[PDB]
């Protein structure tokens, strides 16, 4: 059984590990390989702000809420581990800030200690009038990918830096099963008109005094088009743009200004923060995650493709639930093949 | 007046600033000077872990609870200001951990968002069965002293390197009022057997992933004789000793191991932390803070002394309240000389 995972961001690597950890002991032979044309530090995953938090509105698929919860439970369960920080993980507490009252989010009980903010709390943030406080987890994309690749490599999973031109070519080269974890670029391999780039630009800063996340929301402008500040393990991420349908991979000047001015207003101690980097990435925006089996029919038998893409601005937040479900679907494939 | 402040730790410098702020515009000659034999980074204050948090038990002097509250509200008022971090100040959230149920602290409404830990949170800290969460503030001693000295200097308060041997010699040099902010060494200038050293040793480490304070408690071993982890602005403080009556100023290996091993068991990701420094300091432990006026006579004139020392393991936590109180007592000195505010 030859499995080729296409993609080496959070989705592909986590899925590869989940599959290997699940079946390595019971299925012989099992060959899992990862193909991708970008590894860390060059994926979208690497640019992510690094916070566990789903969107503020519930998902269309109720499956997705459970996948987020399963991911939170997975990550939280590492917290007393000696390797938590080496995985990119640490607990962080923080603020979600609004101009008016809004309903509690669906994930209020998944996180730790959720509550509304008190009036004394809000005076820290004069431009806002209502909010939440909770504890969540930082999962730093870059570190987590480094961790996942060490885990995979240790287990004998081989990596190939390879641009895939078609599923057909990978099937013809010997894959029995393909896991399609190509993120925003999935449409190249099979058109998908629901998949769009969520263009996000960030400024990375050394401001190690900042210990709490602070996410503001502008109801008139859509999620993450409002100042956000997320402390990472070694730097702070400043954000505030998330524009659907913009394919420009170059940083631009108005977005730099939106982020810097917005964030320096939220947190004016940033006047002394040294700029580390400025970066643009494309979230794989889609009305819902595509996670499903498809049969392909080239040559002299079928190759199964299992899609796992379209996680938008919440790929780190949802990844593990998605990985588990793919491994389950892969199990259904093995059963259909009398393995 | 001519005012001499003795001490350049958090207590001396904050008190100097509060007097000067309050009285510069009503007294024409106001001459405030700081004398000290140690300046940042060489004071106790510089070794302090950083955290606003009083002892878990109520103080013998209830005024101390007002002084702590006044300090929190003061510092909190600076959050959202451009210079908070330059003052050494930033918010921080964290955990207080116990091996059995305990009463809520008297300061539970002073901090932000106080509550009990839920079972999933306690699952992060397996050796413990009960605790608190809250948000408070870091006020890093080193950074705050630097800020206060710039602020004082800007207002024309002058600093002198001086080992003061007696109040008499300062009074004879012409001071109308002496503010005694000499921390654990106050007994040198006037015996005070209630004042004792609280020897605290710490390990400073580079572990910038740690965002929360974590303080454990051992009800049988006295406060801060149990592992504690306090993320600072640039590094992390590991502690776990606070031994009263010990004057030994050198680091020792047994305390090093107690702190490292205890804190590595609390927070096992510390295995990768780089050690950046190890330090010992002496909290000025007293059953209560001494904050009072005394009149001393040398020859024909009285000299006014206002003591402000004995703040134990909570000087950063309490300082601004005490500074305001010294300013109030200075007001009374003035008012006794027919001087008007
Ligand atoms: C600025 C920003 C901040 C974010 N912050 C957060 C956050 O705090 N929390 C959170 O949960 N989410 C966040 N997200 C969203 C998150 O980054 C994404 O959902 C996630 O990284 C998507 O992962 P992925 O593995 O699908 O895609 P990617 O990380 O983009 O990986 C795609 C992989 O597919 C490979 N590939 C694609 N096509 C081919 C091909 N034809 N041949 C070979 N290889 C191919 C690529 O080389 C790469 O290895 C953020 C997104 C952005 C833009
Ligand atoms: C390990 C440790 C951790 C701590 N962590 C915290 C914490 O997180 N939060 C908190 O609130 N508190 C903490 N504390 C307590 C805090 O450090 C002290 O309460 C506080 O620093 C006392 O300040 P002070 O200005 O009175 O004394 P110091 O900072 O010792 O300053 C005394 C000044 O008096 C001068 N002086 C003394 N005698 C003379 C003389 N004869 N002539 C001239 N100058 C003289 C010294 O040179 C110095 O300038 C901690 C203490 C220790 C030991
Ligand atoms: C905080 C995070 N979920 C985020 C930030 C910016 C763009 C997309 C997603
Ligand atoms: C946490 C702090 N207030 C402290 C720690 C250790 C000794 C004295 C004081």
Curated annotation (Swiss-Prot), chain A:
> How is the polypeptide modified once translated?
Phosphorylated in the cerebellum; probably not by PRKACA, PRKCA or PRKCE.
Q: What subunit structure does UniProt give?
A: Homodimer. Interacts with BSN (via coiled region); the interaction is direct and inhibits DAO enzyme activity.
Query: What is this protein's record name?
Result: D-amino-acid oxidase
Q: Where does D-dopa bind?
A: 53, 283, 313
**Consequence recorded when altering residue 307 to L:** Reduces activity
pH note? Optimum pH is around 9-10.
Citing just one GO molecular function, the answer is: FAD binding
The entry's cellular-component GO terms read:
cell projection; cytoplasm; cytosol; extracellular region; peroxisomal matrix; peroxisome; presynaptic active zone
Chain sites annotated for binding D-serine: 224, 228, 283, 313
The induction field says:
Repressed in conditions of amino acid starvation in an autophagy-dependent manner.
Q: What class of enzyme is it?
A: oxidoreductase
Chain intervals for the UniProt region annotation (Active site lid that may open upon substrate/product migration in and out of the active site and close to increase the hydrophobicity of the active site, to make the hydride transfer reaction more efficient): 216-228
Per UniProt, D-proline binds at 228, 283, 313
Role played: Catalyzes the oxidative deamination of D-amino acids with broad substrate specificity. Required to catabolize D-amino acids synthesized endogenously, of gastrointestinal bacterial origin or obtained from the diet, and to use these as nutrients. Regulates the level of D-amino acid neurotransmitters in the brain, such as D-serine, a co-agonist of N-methyl D-aspartate (NMDA) receptors, and may modulate synaptic transmission. Catalyzes the first step of the racemization of D-DOPA to L-DOPA, for possible use in an alternative dopamine biosynthesis pathway.
Extra remark = Variation of pH perturbs the enantioselectivity of the enzyme towards some amino acids.
- List the InterPro entries: D-amino_acid_oxidase_CS, DAO, FAD-dep_OxRdtase
Question: Which amino acid positions bind FAD, per UniProt?
Answer: 8-11, 37-38, 43-45, 49-51, 163-164, 182, 283, 312-313, 315-317
From Swiss-Prot, chain B:
Please verify whether the record's keywords include Oxidoreductase: yes
* Stretch list, region Active site lid that may open upon substrate/product migration in and out of the active site and close to increase the hydrophobicity of the active site, to make the hydride transfer reaction more efficient: 216-228
Quickly give the catalysed reaction: a D-alpha-amino acid + O2 + H2O = a 2-oxocarboxylate + H2O2 + NH4(+); D-alanine + O2 + H2O = pyruvate + H2O2 + NH4(+); D-cysteine + O2 + H2O = 2-oxo-3-sulfanylpropanoate + H2O2 + NH4(+); D-dopa + O2 + H2O = 3-(3,4-dihydroxyphenyl)pyruvate + H2O2 + NH4(+)
EC number(s) of the enzyme? 1.4.3.3
Question: What is its induction behaviour?
Answer: Repressed in conditions of amino acid starvation in an autophagy-dependent manner.
Q: Where does D-serine bind?
A: 224, 228, 283, 313
Q: Which InterPro entries match?
A: D-amino_acid_oxidase_CS, DAO, FAD-dep_OxRdtase
Modes of activity regulation: Inhibited by benzoate, sodium benzoate, thiolactomycin, and hydrogen peroxide. Inhibited by 6-chloro-1,2-benzisoxazol-3(2H)-one (CBIO) and benzo[d]isoxazol-3-ol (BIO). Malonate and meso-tartrate has no effect on activity.
Q: Tell me, what is an example of a GO biological process annotation in this record? A: digestion
- In this chain, the stretch annotated as Required for protein stability covers 1-16
> What's its top-level EC category?
oxidoreductase
Q: Which UniProt keywords apply?
A: Cell projection, Cytoplasm, FAD, Flavoprotein, Oxidoreductase, Peroxisome, Phosphoprotein, S-nitrosylation, Secreted, Synapse
By its UniProt entry, which Gene3D superfamilies does this protein fall under? D-Amino Acid Oxidase, subunit A, domain 2 (3.30.9.10), NAD(P)-binding Rossmann-like Domain (3.40.50.720)
Mainly resides where?
A: other
Q: What protein family does this chain belong to?
A: Belongs to the DAMOX/DASOX family.
Other remarks on record?
A: Variation of pH perturbs the enantioselectivity of the enzyme towards some amino acids.
Describe the subunit structure: Homodimer. Interacts with BSN (via coiled region); the interaction is direct and inhibits DAO enzyme activity.
Q: What is the name of the protein in this document?
A: D-amino-acid oxidase
Organism in which the protein naturally occurs: Sus scrofa
What are the leading ranks of the lineage? Eukaryota, Metazoa, Chordata, Craniata, Vertebrata
């Amino acid at each position: 059984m030859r499995v080729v995972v296409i993609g080496a961001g959070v989705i592909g690597l986590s899925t590869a590990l989940c599959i290997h950890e699940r079946y390595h002991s019971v299925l012989q032979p099992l060959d899992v390989k990862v193909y991708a044309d970008r590894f860390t530090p060059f994926t979208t995953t690497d640019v992510a702000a690094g916070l566990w938090q789903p969107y503020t509105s519930e998902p269309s698929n109720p499956q997705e809420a459970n996948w987020n919860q399963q991911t939170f439970n997975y990550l939280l369960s590492h917290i007393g581990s000696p390797n938590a920080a080496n995985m990119g993980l640490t607990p962080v507490s923080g603020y979600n800030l609004f101009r008016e009252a809004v309903p509690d989010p669906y994930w209020k009980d998944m996180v730790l200690g959720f509550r509304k903010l008190t009036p004394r709390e809000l005076d820290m943030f004069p431009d806002y009038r209502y909010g939440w406080f909770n504890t969540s987890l930082i999962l730093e994309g870059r570190k987590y990918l480094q961790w996942l690749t060490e885990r995979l490599t240790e287990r004998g999973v081989k990596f190939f830096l390879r641009k895939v031109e078609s599923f057909e070519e990978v099937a013809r080269g010997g894959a029995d099963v393909i896991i399609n974890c190509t993120g925003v670029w999935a449409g190249v391999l099979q058109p998908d008109p629901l998949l769009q780039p969520g263009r996000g630009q960030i400024i990375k800063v050394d401001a190690p005094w900042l210990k709490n996340f602070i996410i503001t929301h502008d109801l008139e402008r859509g999620i993450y088009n409002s100042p956000l500040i997320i402390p990472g393990l070694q730097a702070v991420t400043l954000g505030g743009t998330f524009q659907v349908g913009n394919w420009n991979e170059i940083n631009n000047i108005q977005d730099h200004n939106t982020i810097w001015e917005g964030c320096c207003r939220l947190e004016p101690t940033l006047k002394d923060a040294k700029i580390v980097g400025e970066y643009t990435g494309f979230g794989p925006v889609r009305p819902q995650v595509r996670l499903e089996r498809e049969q392909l029919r080239f040559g002299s038998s079928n190759t199964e493709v299992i899609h796992n893409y379209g996680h938008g601005g919440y790929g780190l937040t949802i990844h593990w639930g998605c990985a588990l479900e793919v491994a389950k679907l892969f199990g259904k494939v093995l059963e259909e093949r009398n393995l």
